[PDB]
Amino acid sequence: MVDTSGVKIHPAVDNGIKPAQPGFAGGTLHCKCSTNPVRVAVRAQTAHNHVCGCTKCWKPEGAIFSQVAVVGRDALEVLEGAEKLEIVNAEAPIQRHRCRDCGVHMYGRIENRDHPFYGLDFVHTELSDEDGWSAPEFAAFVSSIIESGVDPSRMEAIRARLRELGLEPYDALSPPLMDAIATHIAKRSGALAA
Amino acid sequence: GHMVDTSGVKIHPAVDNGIKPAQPGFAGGTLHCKCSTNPVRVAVRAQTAHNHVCGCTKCWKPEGAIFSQVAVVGRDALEVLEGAEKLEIVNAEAPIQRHRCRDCGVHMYGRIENRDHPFYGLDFVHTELSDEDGWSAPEFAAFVSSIIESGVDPSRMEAIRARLRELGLEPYDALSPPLMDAIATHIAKRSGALAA
Ligand SMILES: [Zn+2]
Ligand SMILES: [Zn+2]
Ligand SMILES: [Zn+2]
Ligand SMILES: [Zn+2]
């Protein structure tokens, strides 16, 4: 029915989704600087890798979606180049740490102890040379790619291409992630027991 | 035959035991609050669009119900007929100001006062408050995961979603993709990002 040729999502998925390696123990993330790069050690497997359509997160050059996963924050350590890192917005509830010279977000931290995603850093595993990272599971904030200049009439083919890659399109997070967030909110507010 | 057990799942009285369809050239009617005497009455002098059930925590829901049913009409077609003095704004700071009868608790309409909002010029109405049939039928389920914030156990979610799909109410954790792409198109056109 729908014509899916020439639709690009993110280069990590354009030729199909790479599998995780069982027993993957982590690796290293590097910014894009030819010299004195920021290096971050990710000392665990990631979870919930997905492509993301929101305007706030780092995409490679010419990419409509970003690819972003989560790791427990104890697993993260800036190896080299911490001086080179600046926060993209200190007001943002997830605080993006970006390299000063190439503009590459090395991680995103939640400093709010009450935020649902607290304890978990947000990393772009494409910044690693090693394969075997947690595979992209879904597409998030899909309708928000329009806010970066994607033409609405392109949306049918984008979603049809996401689905053929196996990445279910959502206009928020995946349903299990959204129930996780609502449960956290409800436990904080007293709507739910605990 | 069937994969998820959906028995006992109640959504909204207006979908639980049959969904009444639209009827042709329906031209509107009157919403009444639940006060046994001197109710707020509001005229809705057009057919609604985009009726959906909604799990958010801000919409009015009849006693028992886990979803509200809410539709949209041009503000031009909506008029308070009796009982303006029994209405109060729930939260005058929300993007949608919900006008609720201070006596029975029923929201008689929701109005957007920000001229820049994607839905400006559209009121929100619970057409179950009309004793006439013929209204636009619910089309999907929105803000589904948000029913957890009102105290639904997350273990219920799978049965609840399956049951929505059995009614033809595709569940989304936001609005539906067309409405979501429309909100986005609005935002982009204002911000520069999308032409003209
Ligand atoms: Zn750099
Ligand atoms: Zn994003
Ligand atoms: Zn009343
Ligand atoms: Zn609602």
Swiss-Prot record, chain A:
| Cofactor remark from the record | Binds 2 Zn(2+) ions per subunit.
> ATP-binding: is it a keyword of this entry?
no
* Annotated binding of Zn(2+) 1, by residue: C31, C33, C99, C102
Tell me where in this chain the CENP-V/GFA domain is found. 24-171
User: In the Enzyme Commission scheme, what number(s) does this protein have?
Assistant: 4.4.1.22
Note the InterPro entries from the entry: CENP-V/GFA, Formald_GSH, Mss4-like_sf
- Hey, which pathway is this one from? One-carbon metabolism; formaldehyde degradation; formate from formaldehyde (glutathione route): step 1/3
The record's top EC class is: lyase
Gene Ontology MF annotations: S-(hydroxymethyl)glutathione synthase activity; zinc ion binding
Q: What are the required cofactors?
A: Zn(2+)
| Pfam short name (any one) | GFA
Instruction: Name the UniProt key words of this record, in alphabetical order.
Output: Lyase, Metal-binding, Zinc
Q: Which PROSITE patterns match?
A: CENP_V_GFA (PS51891)
Highest taxon listed in the record's lineage: Bacteria
The reaction(s) this protein catalyses = S-(hydroxymethyl)glutathione = glutathione + formaldehyde
State where Zn(2+) 2 binds. Answer: C52, C54, C57
The Gene Ontology biological process annotation of the record reads:
formaldehyde catabolic process
Q: What's this protein's function?
A: Catalyzes the condensation of formaldehyde and glutathione to S-hydroxymethylglutathione.
Q: Family, per the entry?
A: Belongs to the Gfa family.
Record's subunit section: Homodimer.
- The name of this protein is Glutathione-dependent formaldehyde-activating enzyme
Q: Which organism is it from?
A: Paracoccus denitrificans
Q: Which gene encodes it?
A: gfa
